[PDB]
Amino acid sequence: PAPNEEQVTCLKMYFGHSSFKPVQWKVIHSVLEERRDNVAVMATGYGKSLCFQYPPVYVGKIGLVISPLISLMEDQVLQLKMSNIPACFLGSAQSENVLTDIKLGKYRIVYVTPEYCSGNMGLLQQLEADIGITLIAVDEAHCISGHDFRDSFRKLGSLKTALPMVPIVALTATASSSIREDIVRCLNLRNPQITCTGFDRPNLYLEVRRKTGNILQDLQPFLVKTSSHWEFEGPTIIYCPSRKMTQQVTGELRKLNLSCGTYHAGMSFSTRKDIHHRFVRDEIQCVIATIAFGMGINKADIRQVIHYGAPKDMESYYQEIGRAGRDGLQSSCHVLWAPADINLNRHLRNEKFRLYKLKMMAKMEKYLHSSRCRRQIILSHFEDKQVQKASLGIMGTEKCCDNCRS
Numbered sequence: 001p002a003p004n005e006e007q008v009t010c011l012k013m014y015f016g017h018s019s020f021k022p023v024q025w026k027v028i029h030s031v032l033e034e035r036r037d038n039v040a041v042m043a044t045g046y047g048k049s050l051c052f053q054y055p056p057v058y059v060g061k062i063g064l065v066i067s068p069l070i071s072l073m074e075d076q077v078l079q080l081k082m083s084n085i086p087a088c089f090l091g092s093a094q095s096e097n098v099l100t101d102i103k104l105g106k107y108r109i110v111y112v113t114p115e116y117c118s119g120n121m122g123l124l125q126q127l128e129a130d131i132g133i134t135l136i137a138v139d140e141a142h143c144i145s146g147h148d149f150r151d152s153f154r155k156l157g158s159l160k161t162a163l164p165m166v167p168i169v170a171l172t173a174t175a176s177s178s179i180r181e182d183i184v185r186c187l188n189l190r191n192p193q194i195t196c197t198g199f200d201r202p203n204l205y206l207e208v209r210r211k212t213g214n215i216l217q218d219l220q221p222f223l224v225k226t227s228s229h230w231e232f233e234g235p236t237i238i239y240c241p242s243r244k245m246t247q248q249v250t251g252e253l254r255k256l257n258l259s260c261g262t263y264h265a266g267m268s269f270s271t272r273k274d275i276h277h278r279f280v281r282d283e284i285q286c287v288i289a290t291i292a293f294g295m296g297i298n299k300a301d302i303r304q305v306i307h308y309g310a311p312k313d314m315e316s317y318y319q320e321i322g323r324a325g326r327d328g329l330q331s332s333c334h335v336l337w338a339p340a341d342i343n344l345n346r347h348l349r350n351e352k353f354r355l356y357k358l359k360m361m362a363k364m365e366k367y368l369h370s371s372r373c374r375r376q377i378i379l380s381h382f383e384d385k386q387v388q389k390a391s392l393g394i395m396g397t398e399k400c401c402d403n404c405r406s
């Protein structure tokens with residue numbers, strides 16, 4: 001099947017896009033016409049959000065979005081309103097006036113937490129009967145299972161029973177052929193369409209280097225002197241394994257009067273939002289951050305990602321380097337590591353998760369020591385069968401990785 005004129009005019013008018021990506025249309029058609037439950041594993045930057053934002057905008061109904069990343073949900077609600085798409089966050093602290101506007105059908109996309117959703121199942125059935133619920137989205141779906149687990153998700157299996165004619169579309173960036181199964185069981189999904197995309201980001205050069213023991217010695221090669229001032233080549237994210245390491249790296253970089261901000265769960269949500277927004281507005285050139293639950297760094301032109309210390313697992317590496325080069329322009333992702341890092345990772349839920357993570361960590365140590373193409377290694381772990389001409393054209397060249405360089 002193919003999109004009709006009204007479909008393409010809606011996508012361009014409200015989202016600014018000329019065409020639907022292949023798996024984006026496989027999910028949208030399935031929800032819009034077949035009303036079927038969906039599981040979609042798409043690459044970092046592909047555009048999973050359109051799969052849940054577009055269908056309610058086209059039919060003029062309501063979409064229920066469940067997402068853990070509070071800060072970027074606030075960015076998306078503000079983003080939707082700016083694109084003339086009425087959207088809001090529905091919670092217990094929301095006004096009576098905004099809640100009556102939802103009951104009237106004046107809001108296309110409504111964002112809720114798992115707790116609110118379970119505690120207000122009667123409102124959901126009232127919205128379904130009176131207005132109609134196009135779909136119920138579970139963003140970062142790999143959490144109900146896996147390299148990350150959240151038990152708040154478990155109380156969402158009661159949604160299918162209450163709303164059997166409403167499709168649940170669970171979207172994620174990291175989920176293997178076994179991960180998508182336990183999501184179907186915990187959500188009680190009925191014969192869902194299981195879709196996968198290619199996993200390459202060909203505009204991301206890859207390099208692995210050994211740590212010298214001195215922070216400024218390790219990071220100085222990434223810095224350029226512009227007038228008489230030291231700075232990065234462009235917007236940069238430095239990922240650190242601990243909140244303490246984030247503080248030490250920021251401390252050393254501030255001796256060079258570098259424009260940067262730190263980002264960790266030790267800071268309040270308010271201080272975090274400020275740093276993220278200063279990074280997006282290009283007021284800060286570098287963010288030194290830790291990968292911890294509920295956090296995210298969304299920017300379209302990140303030119304460098306530095307992992308200061310060995311990454312946790314292959315899912316962590318993929319999910320973290322995918323923040324670079326969303327504009328399609330040349331970017332770099334460097335790992336600075338030491339064997340002491342991997343031993344620390346060995347110590348820091350279910351036994352299946354532990355075995356899966358330990359397998360990806362042994363793969364991680366192999367990846368770091370390896371003399372083969374970094375790009376060839378990464379795509380084999382996810383058994384990627386959509387490794388296209390664009391990827392093959394970059395492999396074996398200077399722009400691919402450090403091991404492809406002469």
Ligand SMILES: Nc1ncnc2c1ncn2[C@@H]1O[C@H](COP(=O)(O)OP(=O)(O)OP(O)(O)=S)[C@@H](O)[C@H]1O
Nearest residue numbers: 017018019020021043044045046047048049050298
């Ligand atoms: N059909 C499309 N045509 C062109 N650009 C698109 C299309 N769909 C999505 N995009 C763009 O792709 C980018 C995707 O950004 P995000 O929505 O953050 O991606 P994502 O896959 O949800 O990744 P994260 O890492 O989870 S935030 C945005 O610039 C979108 O506007």
Ligand SMILES: Fc1ccc(Cn2cnc3ccccc32)cc1
Nearest residue numbers: 041173174175199314378381382
């Ligand atoms: F380096 C790696 C690259 C991919 C995976 C497997 N994987 C993880 N998340 C995925 C999302 C979509 C498709 C596959 C995926 C493992 C290691």
Ligand SMILES: [Mg+2]
Nearest residue numbers: 048049139140
């Ligand atoms: Mg997403």
Ligand SMILES: [Zn+2]
Nearest residue numbers: 373400401404
């Ligand atoms: Zn290579």
